[PDB]
Copies of this chain bind each other. A is one copy, B any other.
Amino acid sequence: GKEAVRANIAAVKAVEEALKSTYGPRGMDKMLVDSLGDITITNDGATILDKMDLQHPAAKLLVQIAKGQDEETADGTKTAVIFSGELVKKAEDLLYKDVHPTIIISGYKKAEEVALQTIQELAQTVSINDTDLLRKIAMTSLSSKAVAGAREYIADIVVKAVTQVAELRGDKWYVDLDNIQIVKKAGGSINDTQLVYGIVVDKEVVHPGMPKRLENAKIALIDASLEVEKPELDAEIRINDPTQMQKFLDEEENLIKEKVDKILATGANVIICQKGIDEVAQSYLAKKGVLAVRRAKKSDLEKLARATGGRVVSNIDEISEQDLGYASLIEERKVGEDKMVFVEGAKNPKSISILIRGGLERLVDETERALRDALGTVADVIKDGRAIAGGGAVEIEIAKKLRKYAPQVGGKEQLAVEAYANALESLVSILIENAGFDPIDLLMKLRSTHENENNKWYGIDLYAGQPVDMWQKGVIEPALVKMNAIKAATEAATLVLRIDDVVSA
């Protein structure tokens, strides 16, 4: 009976106590000091659970379901855990009062039914042209991150990037993130942030004698070395003769003009590689009038291949007119204090790039995280097409609607249902609390202003501190994330109740 089941509940309740203080943007920050002295300040639900040395099986079963998803978004995760641990919490008081755990699982199951269908008969249809909407949903992702600069810049780009790549897949829109490169440089400002309609190779040209801008450049993506490897790389030479030395390294020098000539046999305007380009081979490309780039990321040859229509080639005796790329005009421009080659006017319109700049050496990294999550989120908004008002709105409803339902559902099973409703309202209470107001007072002030039907989207505006329409202040969010959180948590929750006993090894 009561015995081991408490210890389990208790473990769950502890894990809740590790995230409680960090929910929403008035959330506090947890310090994590790494063993080699290195410091990390965070409020990320995952890390705080992932880096935690748990020894309690309950807690490990609960966080595997809570923390992780087999989805691109990393969001709803603090909700998933908080909501898990409150549902378990509120359930404990029913067992104190002697209700069978079997009932409370069925009760939470009937509540889970309704709660879920209550999101569905209420989301609003959002599709591609609802661009004046996606700008807001995006700020709702970026606003709790560290970005100090204007969010409007970043919101505007994120929208165009998703809409650029969107393509009908079975007569409904789909987007793949892989057609978008994200390049970042510290210093400068966020006003220098932009979308390039091309690909950007962050290695400059071989000599400035090469054209500054080339018209209709037939690109050559060469994975193979355009430089010598050293015959002494494995072990020391066995040549004792400088006459033999000469004729060998000459024939090796004539081998790189061969490699060059075997690619210029196809008549490319531009030649880019991921390894060196010899000092005889740089002079040789310069006298032919080609634009060459030396030692670029294997990462970017790839990014230019499926953009310009080209293929990355690892063998000169294999490059053909079929393998070259097409781009209308390739040029080299200066980004901050580094020159970089840009290859605009490529054959794929889905393929684009983003230049993030501004802020410190770690803040620019977290601006790239924020823009990555915002970009994913907006594309998920297109992939699904439902978006609801945040700030507690759909939540309060799932409670009130459930509370009216409860009377009719059954005997003991009532108390259970009524419990699921109260636990959700506990979430909005924790939220109000960390925001800086009295919970019972603000919740009541909302459940009177949320009794009539026309106040459907009413929540509590965190800074104003009083019940208003969240939708009409931009606070809108993905209806499916905040729906699978209810499924993740209620699973985890009910699983804690499912363990009768433990006999271990």
Contact = CB atoms under 8 A, between A and B. Distances in A.
Contact residues on A (Cβ < 8 Å of other chain), bracket: 10 to 19
A447 to B, nearest CB: 8
Nearest to A411: B444
A339 interface: no
Contact of A411 (B97, B98, B414, B441): B441
Interface in A426-446: 440-441, 444-445
A273 to B, nearest CB: 70
Interface in A71-125: 97-99
A134 to B, nearest CB: 38
A255 to B, nearest CB: 84
Interface string A380-412: 000000000000000000000000000100011
A100 to B, nearest CB: 11
Looking at A99, A415, A440, A445, the one whose CB has the most chain B CB atoms below 10 A away is A440
Contacts of A448: 407
A448 B413 CA distance: 14
Nearest to A445: B411
Contacts of A97: 440
A98 B99 CA distance: 26
Contacts of A444: 411-412, 414
A404 B415 CA distance: 17
A380 B440 CA distance: 46
Contacts of A98: 440
Contacts of A412: 440-441, 444
A414 B448 CA distance: 11
A401 to B, nearest CB: 15
A324 B496 CA distance: 90
A497 to B, nearest CB: 19
A469 B445 CA distance: 40
Contacts of A440: 97-99, 411-412, 415
A88 B407 CA distance: 27
A407 B415 CA distance: 18
A324 B480 CA distance: 101
Contacts of A414: 444
Nearest to A97: B440
A428 to B, nearest CB: 15
A192 B411 CA distance: 50
A415 B415 CA distance: 17
Looking at A415, A441, A444, the one whose CB has the most chain B CB atoms below 10 A away is A444
Nearest to A408: B448
A407 B407 CA distance: 15
Interface in A164-219: none
Nearest to A442: B411
Contacts of A445: 411
Nearest to A412: B440
A440 B96 CA distance: 13
A440 B411 CA distance: 7
A97 B412 CA distance: 24
Contacts of A407: 448
A428 B445 CA distance: 32
A444 B407 CA distance: 9
A94 to B, nearest CB: 11
Interface string A14-40: 000000000000000000000000000
Interface in A106-158: none
Interface string A444-487: 11001000000000000000000000000000000000000000
A137 to B, nearest CB: 33
Nearest to A439: B98
Contacts of A411: 440-441, 444-445
Contacts of A99: 440
A16 B497 CA distance: 34
A223 to B, nearest CB: 68
A441 B99 CA distance: 11
A444 B98 CA distance: 15
Contacts of A415: 440
13 contacts: A97-B440, A98-B440, A99-B440, A407-B448, A411-B440, A411-B441, A411-B444, A411-B445, A412-B440, A412-B441, A412-B444, A414-B444, A415-B440
4 closest pairs, A vs B, by CB? A411-B444, A411-B441, A412-B440, A414-B444
Interface of A: 97-99, 407, 411-412, 414-415, 440-441, 444-445, 448
Given A411-B444, A412-B444, A415-B440, 5 more contacts: A97-B440, A98-B440, A99-B440, A411-B440, A411-B445
